């Protein structure tokens, strides 16, 4: 149950709450207070989803779906079968994720490493909280949040999108997509570079960092280095999820028309707004 090198690291300390009460492991898993918290919120939430499966009449995971309260309920409570189960499960989910992050912080302190991981995860939590919480509250009803089901949540994506035409035209959405595409490009290259240095042509010696640096200079004229590519990856990723949250927080709130028509601010700039020719004249 231990990695060969692991024992020297399994010392007491680092917990944020409850001293040495929960300072122990179950197999590979660290527990901690927030380990216990995560189990509670995760058990409860899973129980409520099962109880929501009987109210619907399916034990089929491709069919099961927990919906928000309909718009009529506003930002108020709802009967369980009619939206209150979603509302409670949502509180349970938020509890599971925040507890998971804070559990990552306790693991960080015992290992004496930095806090970059819990920090990155909180951007994911933030995107979720934008969809199920922030945008609903700004809009005035829980019903605008997405449903918890495998395909029904895809339905919401599609219908919420096309409420505004081709959703391609949300400018924050454009930026978000660029970071996602760019991040995957960077992850491919970084992975490929390290592996090509560690795993050279047969019989050759293991290459070095300088070979990595040379390769990328040979190729594109620049190289960012070891610290920089890990700073770049963390940043392309965190930025993608940032602009995703942004593109949704502005949709249905400060902009509620067709997204393609937003782009008329550009074309009707008065110095060229009237000139003939082109596509828009």
């Amino acid at each position: 149950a231990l990695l060969s090198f692991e024992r020297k690291y399994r010392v007491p300390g680092g917990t944020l709450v409850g001293g040495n009460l929960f300072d122990f492991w179950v197999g590979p898993f660290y527990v901690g207070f927030f380990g216990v918290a995560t189990f509670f919120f995760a058990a409860l939430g899973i129980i409520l989803i099962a109880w929501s499966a009987v109210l619907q009449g399916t034990w089929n995971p491709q069919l099961i779906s927990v919906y928000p309260p309909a718009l009529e309920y506003g930002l108020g409570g709802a009967p369980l079968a009619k939206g209150g189960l979603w509302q409670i499960i949502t509180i349970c989910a938020t509890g599971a994720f925040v507890s998971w992050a804070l559990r990552e912080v306790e693991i960080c302190r015992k290992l004496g490493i930095g806090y970059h991981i819990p920090f990155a995860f909180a951007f994911a939590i933030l995107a979720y909280l934008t969809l199920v919480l922030f945008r609903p509250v700004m809009m005035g009803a829980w019903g605008y949040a997405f449903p918890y089901g495998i395909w029904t949540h895809l339905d919401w994506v599609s219908n919420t999108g096309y409420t505004y035409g081709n959703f391609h035209y949300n400018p924050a959405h454009m930026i978000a997509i660029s970071f996602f595409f760019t991040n995957a490009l960077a992850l491919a290259l970084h992975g490929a570079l390290v592996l090509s240095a560690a795993n050279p042509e047969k019989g050759k010696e293991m290459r070095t960092f300088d070979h990595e640096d040379t390769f990328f200079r040979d190729l594109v004229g620049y190289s960012i280095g070891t610290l920089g590519i890990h700073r770049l990856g963390l940043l392309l990723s965190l930025s993608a999820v940032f602009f995703s949250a942004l593109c949704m927080i502005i949709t249905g709130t400060i902009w509620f028309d067709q997204w393609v028509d937003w782009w008329q601010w550009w074309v009707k700039l008065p110095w060229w707004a009237n000139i003939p020719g082109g596509i828009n004249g």
């Binding site: 020297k8 004496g112 490493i113 300088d210």
Partner: protein, 240 residues
């Protein structure tokens, strides 16, 4: 049809890819052990992979993983409970013994070389043509601990020559002896370098290098280990 043959084939491909990926990631640290160092009974469903051999670059030899695993050092720890899964207490001073957040590994006692076979990390005085080009120059700055006392002063920057990057500050103590602090654990300020991890009275205890013009991979690990460990262990002496 063709489509559902493709998707079914893909899922089988992916399972074998996961298998391959997981066994690849078992070339260190495995086999699993009981807290006493004996092989654990339950290794899980994945087998150890066929070993592979890296030919290291500069006549430095060979690495074959998976291989025989051992800490080439004493671990000053004791069980706090009669059953598996609980913390193991330090039996001495965890900073000195190198346990917990203060851990190091018995890395090779040579320095890392570059692609041309020269020491990757040099002091800047011994580094031909290298100068501070941006930001505050730390050299000559006093160094403060987490108890707000001065521990020493910066007398050079050790640089990564290939990466062209500061990795250590060399610090002179009231001894007249020097130590290395890792760059990633210091705050270079206007009038001082601040060190949160350590209090002034623990700077003497930082492991020393045996030649003054190179660090070894073993020594980097003992130094970075020591100073990181202070976040936990020097927390009595931490004020702000």
């Amino acid at each position: 049809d063709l489509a559902s043959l493709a998707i079914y084939s893909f899922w089988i491909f992916l399972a074998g890819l996961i298998y391959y990926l997981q066994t690849e990631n078992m070339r260190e640290g495995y086999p699993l052990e009981n807290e006493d160092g004996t092989p654990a009974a339950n290794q899980g469903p994945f087998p150890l992979p066929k070993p592979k051999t890296f030919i290291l670059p500069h006549g430095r030899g060979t690495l074959t993983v998976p291989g025989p695993e051992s800490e080439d050092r004493p671990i000053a720890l004791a069980r706090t409970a009669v059953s598996e899964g609980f913390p193991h207490a330090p039996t001495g001073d965890p900073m000195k013994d190198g346990v917990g957040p203060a851990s190091w590994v018995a890395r090779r006692d040579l320095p890392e070389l570059d692609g041309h076979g020269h020491n990757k990390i040099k002091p800047m005085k011994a580094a031909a043509g290298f100068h501070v080009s941006a930001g505050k120059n730390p050299i000559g700055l006093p160094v403060r601990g987490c108890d707000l006392e001065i521990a020493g002063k910066v007398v050079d920057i050790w640089v990564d020559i290939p990466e062209q990057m500061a990795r250590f500050l060399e610090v002179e103590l009231k001894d007249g002896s020097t130590r290395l602090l890792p760059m990633q654990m210091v705050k270079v300020q206007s009038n001082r370098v601040h060190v949160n991890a350590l209090s002034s009275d623990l700077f003497a205890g930082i492991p020393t290098i045996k030649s003054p013009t190179e660090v070894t991979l073993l020594e980097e690990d003992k130094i970075c280990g020591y100073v990181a460990g202070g976040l936990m262990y020097a927390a009595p002496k931490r004020k702000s």
